[PDB]
Amino acid sequence: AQTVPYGIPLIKADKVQAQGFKGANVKVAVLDTGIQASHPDLNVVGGASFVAGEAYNTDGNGHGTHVAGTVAALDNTTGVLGVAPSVSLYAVKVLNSSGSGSYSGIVSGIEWATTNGMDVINMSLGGASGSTAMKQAVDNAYARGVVVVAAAGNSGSSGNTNTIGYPAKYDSVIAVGAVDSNSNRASFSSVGAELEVMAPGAGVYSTYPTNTYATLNGTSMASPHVAGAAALILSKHPNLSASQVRNRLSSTATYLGSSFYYGKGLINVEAAAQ
Amino acid sequence: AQTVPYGIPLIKADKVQAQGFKGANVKVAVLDTGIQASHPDLNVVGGASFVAGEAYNTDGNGHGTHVAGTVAALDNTTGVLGVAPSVSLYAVKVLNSSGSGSYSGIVSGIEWATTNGMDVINMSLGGASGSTAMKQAVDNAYARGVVVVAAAGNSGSSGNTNTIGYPAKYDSVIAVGAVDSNSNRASFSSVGAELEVMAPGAGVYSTYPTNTYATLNGTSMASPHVAGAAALILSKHPNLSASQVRNRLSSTATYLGSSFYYGKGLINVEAAAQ
Amino acid sequence: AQTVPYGIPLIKADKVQAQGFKGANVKVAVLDTGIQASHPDLNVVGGASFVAGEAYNTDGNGHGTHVAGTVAALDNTTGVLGVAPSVSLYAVKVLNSSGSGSYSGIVSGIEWATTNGMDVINMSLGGASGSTAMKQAVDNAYARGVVVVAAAGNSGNTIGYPAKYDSVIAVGAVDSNSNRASFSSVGAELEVMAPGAGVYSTYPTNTYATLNGTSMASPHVAGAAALILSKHPNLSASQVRNRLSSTATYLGSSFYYGKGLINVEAAAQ
Amino acid sequence: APCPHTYKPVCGANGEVYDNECFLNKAGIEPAESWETCRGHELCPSVCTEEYDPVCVEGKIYGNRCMQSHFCGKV
């Protein structure tokens, strides 16, 4: 009754899981539209809400729940399987049911996750510009030992133009682009000099409210694959600093093309966690 | 794994630190909710508690710890960095877990501070009314060589209205307002003619109880910058009187506009310590 | 129509109930001002009274009924919802309508619970002094296999008795943000935290109310023990107790949080 | 001796707060019939940190909860 989305073996996370490392005791905050905690294939340990009138453990959108399942869908007898299924999953809600949020709310969630000792931040979200605050937040979070991952954007490419949004464009954040099951780049995946690594982001099957499953597209789907990978690395090497983890992902990636379009390549966690 | 908060370089405390003057031998007292002594990035060497049931080396609010971090966070391989990272740090607990206190409890700390020979007194606090026992506690502390700093308050401005709080409104105490990264005035910062200087009080990042870090607001974060900017003048020119360290900090400040809003302006630790 | 106080999902008691463990056949005694038995959302199954003139099926104060509600308010279309809504609930009146009791009154209550085979005792009450008879009563209850729970006190090391006894689980209070409440006591004996601020529960005269205190927090733990025992009926008093604190969510210094916020789902794994 | 641990604080005429009326009586203190008699407590604080963490309340909000509470005894 459990299905393994193709993305898991593609980044070879299935190999590292077989080694006995599943991100146990690693803390991961999903900064999104919240998460459907009551979902059977998800275990939301905690979190916070920076969206008025909404609790952190509901999800009127679906986006965040989907992202959560990709990072940490429970390895069990049903549904799907996350990249790091033993992770301590936290739902930090910074976007509402419509999918929208302010700069201050997102910053709030990043500051909370810093204060509260998250090991990894996933931000499947962004915009044309960021803010001085948002920057200060990610830098500090990164300096604290938090692997900070973000979707790069879905604005595609056109000649010479850079289409990476914030926070992905920040250098303390891992900007993550998307490929399909063929390891080919997705036509929507943003491009730019800051593009760091690629991960599955097209036809991604994961959890979805209410108690169901859904196939989505976007770099929002790709980001959480890297987020999970970071958690796997840590479960095998709890010693590693944020940089050491990040660099392992980017310098063991399978080559896929020019870095303006593919960054350093497709993540390979088996190689990363050597 | 140690970031320097944007406060250190903005008041130019990094320039002075680079000359080797980091505030060693200077005794700074934080009159707050206490300090988390066991925090890795903090060395609390002394102090006293004036709240029943709790010691001086614990902080049950977080505020105190986050104020003292902005002053003397250990210059090490981790955490953050304080304005005067070499200061001898003393924790005078005058507030409760809720960040509240009585005029009597504060007078007590001031007095304890005068008796044990603190070089700098920081007070990130303030009531709307004063008390003669507190105006007396400070006046008798300033005259004895102790530099007294305090938050100007977060009462903002409307018309000619003076919104400065005590013990910041006293002439024997340095009233410190708050600015952001861009050197602009925090719209919550108290106005008035007693207002003396400005300092980073917007998105200030520092130590926080139970071995972590938080990003806080308020003139409470602005004060430990000036409190630390004094501990530096006294490591480089350790022969100046309390009035000389003070005159230097205010004269060598950067004018930012009307002194009813910015006071003298953003302190320049580099210039004040030339 | 039924309202789930934030405290139930906060200690994750809904998740455990969802498994099908609701404290069935677990005997819980609320040593308090009595319980309004006739309240639609409460089912009082027995008890005793040590307050001259009053039976156990009334509560002239309100406190006792609030605490009981948090432990075992009926899973309904109505009112609120307890941590262990299937529990076998007993009112043991040891405090009068003004809420005050004597050491011997409370001792009688403890002894009655021990004798009548209660699994759990809740004591949302405290004093500055102890008493040898009281220390002797709780020690013997615990030694016989009673999980003894008490409110750490709101004095704010100002923990009182019987929470201060080591055969008793000392419970402090957090709010819906998981933050320690100003009024929560601190010290070396503080064992775990539970929701105690803004707690909404049954209140005498077929109504409901919101109270603050470690008195509100204690019954969450008492209820947490009923849940654990309906799932693992065979555990000892010390096993249940250790299972509650060793799986607590860390909150900070144990002087202020003890082991931290209880987590029944974890505790009941 | 022995009271319920609800926190319904009461101001003693001696300038000290008690957790609820039952504790007030065990100590033998009288009600103050004036919360001012307990200035600088929490329900009636005369101090506050200067952290900016604003609260509703009404028009004259409050830099923080302590500043909002600097208006005695209220609910």
Numbering used by the authors:
A (entry chain B), B (entry chain C): 1 to 274
C (entry chain A): 1 to 156, 162 to 274
D (entry chain D): 0 to 74
Source paper text:
During our recent work on subtractive ESTs (expressed sequence tags) from the Carcinoscorpius rotundicauda that was infected with Pseudomonas aeruginosa, two isoforms of the non-classical Kazal-type inhibitor, CrSPI, each of 9.3 kDa, were discovered. Earlier, we have proposed that CrSPI-1 may act as an “on-off” regulatory switch in the modulation of antimicrobial activities while maintaining homeostasis of host proteases. CrSPI-1 has been proposed to regulate the serine protease-driven antimicrobial defense during the acute phase of infection while maintaining homeostasis under normal physiological conditions.
Here, we report the crystal structure of the two-headed non-classical Kazal-type group I inhibitor CrSPI-1 in complex with its cognate protease, subtilisin, at a stoichiometric ratio of 1∶2 (CrSPI-1 to subtilisin) and refined up to 2.6 Å resolution. Each CrSPI-1 molecule interacted with two subtilisin molecules, i.e., domain 1 and domain 2 of CrSPI-1 interacted with two independent subtilisin molecules. The third subtilisin molecule of the asymmetric unit was not in a complex with CrSPI-1. The three subtilisin molecules of the asymmetric unit were identical with an rmsd of 0.1 Å in a pairwise superimposition of 274 Cα atoms. This indicates that there was no significant conformational change of subtilisin molecules upon complex formation with the CrSPI-1 molecule. The CrSPI-1 molecule comprises two domains: domain 1 from Cys1 to Glu40 and domain 2 from Leu41 to Leu83. Both domains adopted similar secondary structures (domain 1 β1↑β2↓α1β3↑ and domain 2 β4↑β5↓α2). The reactive site loops of both domains of CrSPI-1 occupy the substrate binding pockets of subtilisin. The reactive site loop (RSL) of domain 1 of CrSPI-1 (Cys1 to Lys6) binds at the active site region of subtilisin from P3 (Cys1) to P3′ (Lys6) in a substrate-like manner. In domain 2 of CrSPI-1, Glu49 takes the position of His3 in the P1 pocket of domain 1 and makes 8 (73%) of the 11 total hydrogen bonding contacts with subtilisin.
